[PDB]
Design an enzyme around this catalytic site. Sequence first.
Site, PDB file in Angstrom:
ATOM      1  N   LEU A  12     -47.498  27.980-106.275  1.00 35.55           N
ATOM      2  CA  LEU A  12     -47.789  26.995-107.320  1.00 35.55           C
ATOM      3  C   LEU A  12     -47.941  27.664-108.691  1.00 35.55           C
ATOM      4  CD1 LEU A  12     -50.310  25.032-105.141  1.00 35.55           C
ATOM      5  CD2 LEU A  12     -48.530  23.854-106.435  1.00 35.55           C
ATOM      6  N   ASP A 120     -66.890  28.011-116.776  1.00 38.00           N
ATOM      7  CA  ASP A 120     -65.483  28.180-117.005  1.00 38.00           C
ATOM      8  C   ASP A 120     -64.777  26.862-117.257  1.00 38.00           C
ATOM      9  OD1 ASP A 120     -63.241  29.733-117.383  1.00 38.00           O
ATOM     10  OD2 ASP A 120     -62.824  29.969-115.271  1.00 38.00           O
TER      11      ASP A 120
HETATM   12  C1  X8G Z   1     -59.351  27.207-107.296  1.00 41.26           C
HETATM   13  C2  X8G Z   1     -58.105  26.323-107.421  1.00 41.26           C
HETATM   14  N1  X8G Z   1     -57.929  25.158-106.793  1.00 41.26           N
HETATM   15  N2  X8G Z   1     -56.855  24.722-107.009  1.00 41.26           N
HETATM   16  C3  X8G Z   1     -56.397  23.517-106.586  1.00 41.26           C
HETATM   17  C4  X8G Z   1     -57.170  22.568-105.930  1.00 41.26           C
HETATM   18  C5  X8G Z   1     -56.558  21.348-105.661  1.00 41.26           C
HETATM   19  N3  X8G Z   1     -55.231  21.042-106.032  1.00 41.26           N
HETATM   20  C6  X8G Z   1     -54.519  21.969-106.692  1.00 41.26           C
HETATM   21  N4  X8G Z   1     -53.223  21.771-107.121  1.00 41.26           N
HETATM   22  C7  X8G Z   1     -52.632  22.702-107.922  1.00 41.26           C
HETATM   23  C8  X8G Z   1     -53.315  23.854-108.169  1.00 41.26           C
HETATM   24  C9  X8G Z   1     -52.878  24.874-108.935  1.00 41.26           C
HETATM   25  C10 X8G Z   1     -51.724  24.798-109.496  1.00 41.26           C
HETATM   26  C11 X8G Z   1     -50.980  23.719-109.313  1.00 41.26           C
HETATM   27  C12 X8G Z   1     -51.372  22.652-108.555  1.00 41.26           C
HETATM   28  C13 X8G Z   1     -49.949  24.082-110.043  1.00 41.26           C
HETATM   29 CL1  X8G Z   1     -48.557  23.150-110.303  1.00 41.26          CL
HETATM   30  N5  X8G Z   1     -50.135  25.295-110.581  1.00 41.26           N
HETATM   31  N6  X8G Z   1     -51.147  25.702-110.269  1.00 41.26           N
HETATM   32  C14 X8G Z   1     -51.885  27.001-110.570  1.00 41.26           C
HETATM   33  N7  X8G Z   1     -55.150  23.135-106.928  1.00 41.26           N
HETATM   34  C15 X8G Z   1     -56.243  25.570-107.875  1.00 41.26           C
HETATM   35  C16 X8G Z   1     -57.024  26.591-108.113  1.00 41.26           C
HETATM   36  C17 X8G Z   1     -56.713  27.818-109.012  1.00 41.26           C
HETATM   37  N8  X8G Z   1     -56.212  27.365-110.322  1.00 41.26           N
HETATM   38  C18 X8G Z   1     -56.510  28.185-111.549  1.00 41.26           C
HETATM   39  C19 X8G Z   1     -56.712  26.816-112.270  1.00 41.26           C
HETATM   40  O1  X8G Z   1     -55.569  26.353-112.985  1.00 41.26           O
HETATM   41  C20 X8G Z   1     -56.820  26.151-110.925  1.00 41.26           C
END
Ligand code: X8G
Length: 258
Positions: A12, A120
């Site tokens: 992702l 954060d």
């Molecule tokens: C601790 C955590 N939970 N979590 C997460 C939880 C539920 N759905 C999703 N969906 C989702 C999560 C992250 C995504 C995308 C979609 C895409 Cl597209 N890019 N990225 C980094 N992601 C994602 C993270 C880490 N990321 C750094 C910040 O941008 C969030």
Amino acid sequence: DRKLLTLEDKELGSGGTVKKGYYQMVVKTVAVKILDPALKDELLAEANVMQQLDNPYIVRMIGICEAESWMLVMEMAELGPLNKYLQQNRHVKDKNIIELVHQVSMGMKYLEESNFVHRDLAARNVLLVTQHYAKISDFGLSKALRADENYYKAQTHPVKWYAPECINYYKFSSKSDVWSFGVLMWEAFSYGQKPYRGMKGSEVTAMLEKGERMGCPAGCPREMYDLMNLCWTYDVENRPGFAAVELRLRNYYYDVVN
Ligand SMILES: Cc1nn(-c2ccnc(Nc3ccc4c(c3)c(Cl)nn4C)n2)cc1CN1CC(O)C1
């Protein structure tokens, strides 16, 4: 139980890796954060906080997975980080952006009542279940406050989202999450624009202590920009709490509905 989780080859996003998976419970779709002895402890602490939280506008964790790597598995928000989305979807109405940040403030208010400090809060660490549904993510830095103190105190140290008291005194309170929420609101009405563009965190700090703040984002209801600025009150004790902020977002939201 690792074999009851399946993952994609691709990521992702990155910075370790974040990956979509399916956890056989009907399967549910899920997101796993994929990870020196210190880092486990952090992921494990990161997970301890989420467990304690129960809110519509906070991402629900499922649990932790010890397998090939250390892995964190949460209820997955298909639509992803609020900022990236908004950038790529300029057509979204301010009425909907209000809706979304009222949701984040409702999520943050619960967090305040539960005497936990996020540390954060930012547009990247808000995720969209749907275009009308927002949840706060990334409790990696979060602390449960002591029963007798309203702030967490740190050692030597994200600068552009942090209140002055955090930069100067290392004090992180619900009120410092209000500062960040302010920057998160700015980011939202600037359709995913980065805050204080082009500056060094040090310059940003010099700017704030001169009394200066970021300008209004094009299209931004003045009332929301006024709130950004109440959120950016320098004195921690005059800066409103999350109850006070939520109240103003709610009252304002309804008058715009019809
Ligand atoms: C601790 C955590 N939970 N979590 C997460 C939880 C539920 N759905 C999703 N969906 C989702 C999560 C992250 C995504 C995308 C979609 C895409 Cl597209 N890019 N990225 C980094 N992601 C994602 C993270 C880490 N990321 C750094 C910040 O941008 C969030």
